[PDB]
C-alpha cells in the first residue's frame, strides 16, 4: 500500500490520476500536509520542494520537476534558447526578443525587415501595447505563412504531450491534437488566434482535429505523411529543449524525484516546417484522451518507482 | 539527575509493587537477600536508580511500603524477595481505610502520613540526584486511593521541582470490590490532574479481558492481573534502568511524552503476551503492541489520536527492522497520528530481553482514547450521584458533595479537553 | 582562468582561480534577563505552594 | 601562536570533540600520554600545533579545549578514556542535572548556575595564550545544553572577549539519528539568541551523515560514534588550515573574510571522498564533482536551484594545482554553478599535504587524497525552512511551551526568534533570486 497527497484540485489530469490511484486499492489519499507521503501531486505555485525527500524510511515522487520554469514561462524560454550553447541563438523556434531588456535589437531588427515583418507580444507597426498594459513581455515573429488546412483555410496548433520520469526518459504520448481556427485573413481577428478559448464547431468538433485525420490530410493534399512531414521535427524540438535544461532539474542523485508532463505547441509553416511556439508545465488534455493518457501517467511515471503497444514513443534512453 | 524513589501504597500498589521488584530484581541480577549475581555489566550500571548500595554488595530496593491494614504488608515481608527491603520502610496503620477514599485522603491517612514522609526524607537525602518519585496503587480503593493521592500532595509541596509518577490501576465493574470505585476513582483522577506529571494508566477492565479472551484463561486472579503489570513496569521502566543510546530520565519522558500540562495519561501496551518458546519476529512484536488487544488501558487507539509515543524494544533482534516496522506501522496508519506534532514516535532498543522471553516490545503512548476511560468512569459516577447514593460513607468523614461535583467536572473537562486535539 | 596568489610552502599550496569578475548586550543586560527569568519562576513557586497550603 | 580555543557543549559536541581530538592527535602525532616524539622543541614551540595544543615541561601536548555538559556522563567517559590523560581534570566540567531537551533549562535555570565556572576555566586557558584568535564551538542545536548554555555563553564570550572571534559547528536536528520532539523549537531559540554572537557557522545535518554512513560505507544502522568520526574528519579538513602550514584560512578571520559576505548570511554549506576499505583511487576531478554531488553535502540541499556567492576548495593529500584548475574548468562547463551577479565566480584553492588519517579499525579508508568543498548558497536556506515549518505546526497549537514558561521563559521569545528565522529566510531570498 502507497500513500498519496493531492494539492491541485484544479489539476484535471491529476484529477483523473488520483482517480485511477484510489481504484486500484493499493493506494491511500492522505490529507494535504500530512508529511509521510510517498507521492505528491503538488500545487503549480510555490511548491515546497525544500520539504520533500526528507522523511525517514519514505521514497517521496512529487508531479513537477523543479526548474523547468524556465520552459514553461514565455520571456524565461527566450532567454533560455538565446543564450544556451546547446541551443545557438536555433531554426525552429521564432525570432524573439524580450523587453520590460533587449529593445534596441528588436527595432534594429524590424528595420531590417520594414526594409521590404508583422510581430506579436499581433501588429506591424512597431507600438507600446506593453506599456499600456501589465508584466514582463517577448516581442516575436508573427508566423505569416502558415500552413492552412485547406478545406477551409484554416490555422491551427499541434499540441504534443510529453513525459519525463524520474529517470529522464522523455515519452512522447502517441496521441496528440490539432486546435482548428473561421477562416484565415492575413489583413485582419479571432481567427488568427487558434485558441479554443477564443475560439468558442464546423469543421471539427470543438474545432480539435485528431492525428488519424490529419495524417489522411497530409497524405491525401500532400503526399506526405504526419510522420514525415511534421513528427521528426516535433521529436526533434522536443529532445533540445529537455536534454538541454536535464543538468539543471535532474533529480537522478536527489533525496526525492521528479516527474512531469509537459504540453510543446507547434505551429506549421506552409513548407511543412514545425515551430515551437511555448511549452505549458501544467497542460490539460483532449477529453477523449484523458482517459489514456492519465493511466500511462500512472503506468509509466508512478508505478515505476512505486509496483503495484506501449502509448508512448521513447524519445529518450 | 538518577536516582528514583517508590513508593507502594494500599493493597494493590503493593502488590503490583513487589511484584515489580521480584521482576527487575531479577533482571539486574539481585536475588532475595540483596547479593549480586549475574553475568553482564549492563546490569549493574544503572542500578544506583532503583537500588541503594548497602554494606557488602548487598542493594536495596529504594521503596517505600505503605498501608492503612497491616495485611498486604505482612504478605509481602513474607513472601519471595520479602526482606530484600529495608524493614525500617514498612510505614503502616492498623485501621484500614475501608475502600474509602475520604479515610485515606482526610481522616485516617493524615494520621500516617507525617510517618510516611520522614522515610521519604531519609531517602531522598540520601541521594546524589534525586529525579522524582514513582508511585504504585489503585484509584479504587481507599489507602492507595486517597492517602496516595494525598502523598502526591505532600510530596509535591516538599519537593515542587521532582518528578510525580505513578502506575495508577483504574477500577472497572468487570473485576470490581466496591460499587464506590467510581467515586474513589474521580476523586484521585483529580488528584492526578493537578499533582502528577506522567500517570500510567492500567485499566483492570484491559487486564481481565486480555486475560480471558486472550491469553484465553477463564477464571483470573489478581496474581493474572499482575503478571500483565508487572511486564509493563519493567518494559516502561527499561529506558532509566538500562544503559544505552537515550539514556532515559523521568523528566525528558514527561518532556518529550506531555504537549500539554494535564494532559499526561499514558497507555501501555506490551507484546509478546504471556501467562513461549518460540521467538516471534520484528515484524510480529510490532504489529501485536500496537493492536488494541495488547492495550493495557480499554481504549481502542483507532477511536483517537496518538500526540505522543514511545517504543521500547528488548532483546537481540536487527535494528534495521525495528526501524523499518516502526515507520511501517506510522506510515501505513499516518491517520491516527497528529500532524502537529511532528516525528513523535521515538523508539529505543536494549538488548538485555525480559525474563522468558528472547524478545519484547513496550510501548507508551499519549493518545486521546484515554478520555474514553474517564468517559466510563464519569459515567458511572454520575449515576451515583445523582441519587446521592454512598455518599453517606465519605459525608461522615467530613467531606461535601462540592468536592465531588468539582471532581466530576474536572475529568469531565479532561475528556473535553482531549478531544478537542482528537479534531485537529 | 585566472590564477593568482600562489603561495607554495614544504606543507601546501594556496592559490585563488577566479571563472568571471563580478557585476551587542552587557552582562549586566543578560544578567537581568537570566535573573528576569530566576524571578518568574520563583512567582509561579510561590503560587502553587500557596495553593498547596490552601 | 594565534591559538584556538575549542569549546564543547553537550553531548554531541562533547562526544564529537573527542574524536575530532583523538583525530588530531594521530594527525599531529602526538600519543595518549599527550607526548609527540616528533616535538623536539620540549616545553614549548610557536609550531602551528601549538594552536591547538599546549605542551608542559614533560613534554605533554594538551589539548586547549574545555568539555562542559550539564550531566556527569559523557564528558566522565573522556575523564576515564584512552585520551583521559591528554586532558586536565578543569577543562572537564561536567554538572548534575542535564536540561531535560528544553533550551529554557539550560539557558536559565541549570545555565546561570555554572557559566561564571566555565568562563573561569577559560581564562585559564585564555591566559595561557599569547594571542588568541578565538574560540571553536562544537554543539548540538537540539539539546537543552545544547542549545541553552551555548547560547548564553556565547553571549558572554562576546562580551568578555569581545575582539576575538567565535566559530561553530553545530548539529542540525534529522528525525532519525535520535531527536526530541521539541529539537525544533531549541533550535530556532538558539539560532536567534545566537546569529549575532558567531561569525562563521558549519551546520551538519545529521540525516546527511546518516545517509552516508549508510550508503558509502554500507553501516546498516550508523552509531553515533561511526558518524562522529566522519563529521570530526570534516571538521579536521577545515580545521587544518590552523594547525598545519598553509596560507588558506590560517586565521580564524579569514574564514568569515572568505566566505561570509554579509554578518548573518554566515552559514557555508561543506561537502566532502568517503570510502569504504573494500581500492578504486578516486582523481581531483572526481572527487571535486563529487564536492558538488548534492549526495556528499552534510547538509541536504539543492544547490542548483540557489545560488553561489562563495566556493572555497580544501584538498589533502596528492593533489597538485594544476589538476585542480582543470577539474574546475571541466566542472564549471558540465554542472550548473551560478553565482550571484555581486560575486566574482572564482574557487579559492587550498592545499595541505599532510595526507588524511583514519582511526585504526574504523570504517573510513586511508586514502591517498580528499577534498572539502565550502560554499555559500543560499540554498542552505533550506534547512531553516524545514525547520520553521516544524517549529509553526508545534507553537500554533502552543505544544510542550509550558515546559519553558514554566523555566522562566515568555511565549513572546519564541515568536521574536521566529521571527528572526523569518527575516533570515528572507535575506537569502533576496541575496539568492
Ligand atoms: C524510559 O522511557 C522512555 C522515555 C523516552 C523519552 C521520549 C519520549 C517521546 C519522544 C522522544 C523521547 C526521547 S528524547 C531525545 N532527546 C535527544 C535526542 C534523542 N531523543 C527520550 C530520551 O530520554 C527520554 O526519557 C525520552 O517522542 C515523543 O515521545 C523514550 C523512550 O524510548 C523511545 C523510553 O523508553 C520506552
Ligand atoms: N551526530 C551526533 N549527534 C548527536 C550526538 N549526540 C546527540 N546527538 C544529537 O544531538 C541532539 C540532542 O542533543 P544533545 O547534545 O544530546 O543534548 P544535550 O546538549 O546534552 O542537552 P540535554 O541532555 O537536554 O542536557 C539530537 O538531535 C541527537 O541527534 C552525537 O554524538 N553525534
Ligand atoms: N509567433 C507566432 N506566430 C503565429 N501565431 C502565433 C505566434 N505566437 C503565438 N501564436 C498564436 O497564439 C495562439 C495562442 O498561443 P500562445 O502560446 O501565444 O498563448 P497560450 O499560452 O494561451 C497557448 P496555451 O493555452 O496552449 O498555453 C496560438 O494558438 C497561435 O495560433
Ligand atoms: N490489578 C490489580 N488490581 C487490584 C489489586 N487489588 C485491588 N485491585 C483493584 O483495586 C481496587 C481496590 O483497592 P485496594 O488496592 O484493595 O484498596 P486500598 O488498600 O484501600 O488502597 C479495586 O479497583 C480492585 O479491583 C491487584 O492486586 N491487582
Ligand atoms: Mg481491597
Ligand atoms: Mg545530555
Sequence with gaps: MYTFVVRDENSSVYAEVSRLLLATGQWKRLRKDNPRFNLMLGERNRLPFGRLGHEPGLVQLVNYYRGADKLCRKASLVKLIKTSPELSECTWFPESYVIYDEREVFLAAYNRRREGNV????????????????????????????????????????????????????????????????????????????????????????????????????????????????????????????????????????????????????????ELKVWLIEVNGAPACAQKLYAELCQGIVDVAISSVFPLTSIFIKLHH | ???????????????????????????????????????????????????????????????????????????????????????????????????????????????????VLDVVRKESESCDCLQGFQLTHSLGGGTGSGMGTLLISKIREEYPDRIMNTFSVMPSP?????????????????????????????????????????????????????????????????????????????????????????????????????????????????????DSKNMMAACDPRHGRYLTVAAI???????????????????????????????????????????????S?????????????????????????????????????????????????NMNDLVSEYQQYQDA | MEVIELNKCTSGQSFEVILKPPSDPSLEEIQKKLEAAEERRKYQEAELLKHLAE | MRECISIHVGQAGVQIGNACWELYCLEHGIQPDGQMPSDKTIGGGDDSFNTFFSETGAGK??????????????????????????????????????????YARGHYTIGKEIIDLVLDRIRKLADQCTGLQGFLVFHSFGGGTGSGFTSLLMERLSVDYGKKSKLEFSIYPAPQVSTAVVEPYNSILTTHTTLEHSDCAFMVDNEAIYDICRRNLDIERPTYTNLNRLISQIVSSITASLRFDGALNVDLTEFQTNLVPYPRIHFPLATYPVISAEHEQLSVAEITNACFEPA???????????????????????????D??????????????????????????????????????????????????????????????????????????????????????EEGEFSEAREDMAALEKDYEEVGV
Design chain 1, 119 to 270: 510581430w506579436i507580444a499581433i501588429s506591424s507597426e512597431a507600438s507600446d501595447f506593453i506599456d499600456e498594459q501589465g508584466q514582463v513581455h517577448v516581442i516575436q515573429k508573427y508566423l505569416e505563412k502558415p500552413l492552412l488546412l485547406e478545406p477551409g483555410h484554416r490555422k491551427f496548433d499541434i499540441r504534443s504531450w510529453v513525459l519525463v520520469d524520474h529517470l529522464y526518459n522523455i515519452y512522447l504520448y502517441r496521441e496528440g491534437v490539432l486546435r482548428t481556427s473561421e477562416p484565415y485573413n492575413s489583413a485582419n481577428k479571432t481567427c488568427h488566434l487558434t485558441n479554443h478559448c477564443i475560439q468558442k464547431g464546423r469543421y471539427e468538433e470543438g474545432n480539435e482535429m485528431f492525428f488519424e485525420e490529419f495524417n489522411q490530410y497530409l497524405m491525401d493534399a500532400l503526399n506526405t505523411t504526419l510522420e514525415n512531414s511534421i513528427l521528426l521535427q516535433i521529436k526533434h524540438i522536443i529532445r533540445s529543449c529537455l536534454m538541454c535544461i536535464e543538468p539543471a532539474i535532474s533529480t537522478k542523485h536527489l533525496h526525492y524525484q521528479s516527474f512531469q508532463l509537459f504540453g510543446f505547441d507547434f505551429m506549421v509553416d506552409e
Design chain 2, 1 to 115: 539527575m538518577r536516582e528514583i524513589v517508590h513508593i507502594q501504597a494500599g493493597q494493590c500498589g503493593n502488590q503490583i509493587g513487589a511484584k515489580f521488584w521480584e521482576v527487575i530484581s531479577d533482571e539486574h541480577g539481585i536475588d532475595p537477600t540483596g547479593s549480586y549475581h549475574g553475568d553482564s555489566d549492563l546490569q549493574l550500571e544503572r542500578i544506583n536508580v532503583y537500588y541503594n548500595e548497602a554494606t557488602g554488595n548487598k542493594y536495596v530496593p529504594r521503596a517505600i511500603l505503605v498501608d492503612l491494614e497491616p495485611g498486604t504488608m505482612d504478605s509481602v515481608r513474607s513472601g519471595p524477595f520479602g526482606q530484600i527491603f529495608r524493614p525500617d520502610n514498612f510505614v503502616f496503620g492498623q485501621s484500614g481505610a475501608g475502600n474509602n477514599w475520604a479515610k485515606g485522603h482526610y481522616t485516617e491517612g493524615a494520621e500516617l502520613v507525617d510517618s
Design chain 2, 174 to 290: 468487570k473485576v470490581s470490590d466496591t460499587v464506590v470505585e467510581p467515586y474513589n476513582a474521580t476523586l484521585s483522577v483529580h488528584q492526578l490532574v493537578e499533582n502528577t506529571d506522567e500517570t500510567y494508566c492500567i485499566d483492570n477492565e484491559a487486564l481481565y479481558d486480555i486475560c480471558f479472551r486472550t491469553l484465553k484463561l477463564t477464571t483470573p486472579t489478581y496474581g493474572d492481573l499482575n503478571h500483565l503489570v508487572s511486564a509493563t513496569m519493567s518494559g516502561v521502566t527499561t529506558c532509566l534502568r538500562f544503559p544505552g543510546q537515550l539514556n532515559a530520565d523521568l523528566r525528558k519522558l514527561a518532556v518529550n511524552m506531555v504537549p500539554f500540562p494535564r494532559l499526561h495519561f499514558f497507555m501501555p501496551g506490551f507484546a509478546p503476551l504471556t501467562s513461549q518458546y518460540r521467538a516471534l519476529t520484528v515484524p510480529e512484536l510490532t504489529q501485536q503492541m500496537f
Design chain 2, 313 to 359: 524494544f528488548r532483546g537481540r533482534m536487527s535494528m534495521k527492522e525495528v526501524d523499518e516496522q516502526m515507520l511501517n506501522v506510522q506510515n501505513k496508519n499516518s491517520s491516527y497520528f497528529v500532524e502537529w506534532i511532528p516525528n513523535n514516535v521515538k523508539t529505543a532498543v536494549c538488548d538485555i530481553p525480559p525474563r522468558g522471553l528472547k524478545m
Design chain 2, 361 to 409: 516490545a513496550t510501548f507508551i503512548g499519549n493518545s486521546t482514547a484515554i478520555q474514553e476511560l474517564f468517559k466510563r468512569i464519569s459515567e458511572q459516577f454520575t449515576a451515583m450521584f445523582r441519587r446521592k447514593a454512598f455518599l453517606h460513607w465519605y459525608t461522615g468523614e467530613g467531606m461535601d458533595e462540592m468536592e465531588f461535583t468539582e471532581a466530576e467536572s
Design chain 4, 61 to 102: 601536548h594538551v589539548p586547549r579545549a574545555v568539555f562542559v555538559d550539564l550531566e556527569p556522563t559523557v564528558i566522565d567517559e573522556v575523564r576515564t578514556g584512552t585520551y583521559r590523560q591528554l586532558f586536565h581534570p578543569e577543562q572537564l566540567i561536567t554538572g548534575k542535572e542535564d536540561a531535560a531537551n528544553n
Design chain 4, 296 to 322: 556528499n553535502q552534510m547538509v541536504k540541499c539543492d544547490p542548483r536551484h540557489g545560488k553561489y556567492m562563495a566556493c572555497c576548495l580544501l584538498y589533502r593529500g596528492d593533489v597538485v594545482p594544476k
Design chain 4, 324 to 409: 585542480v584548475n582543470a577539474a574546475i574548468a571541466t566542472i564549471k562547463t558540465k554542472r550548473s554553478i551560478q553565482f550571484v551577479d555581486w560575486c566574482p565566480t572564482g574557487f579559492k584553492v587550498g592545499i595541505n599535504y599532510q595526507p588524511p588519517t583514519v582511526v585504526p579499525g574504523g570504517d573510513l579508508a586511508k586514502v591517498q587524497r580528499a577534498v572539502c568543498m565550502l560554499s555559500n548558497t543560499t540554498a542552505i536556506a533550506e534547512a531553516w525552512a524545514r525547520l520553521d515549518h516544524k517549529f509553526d505546526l508545534m507553537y500554533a497549537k502552543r505544544a510542550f511551551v509550558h515546559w519553558y514558561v514554566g523555566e522562566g521563559m
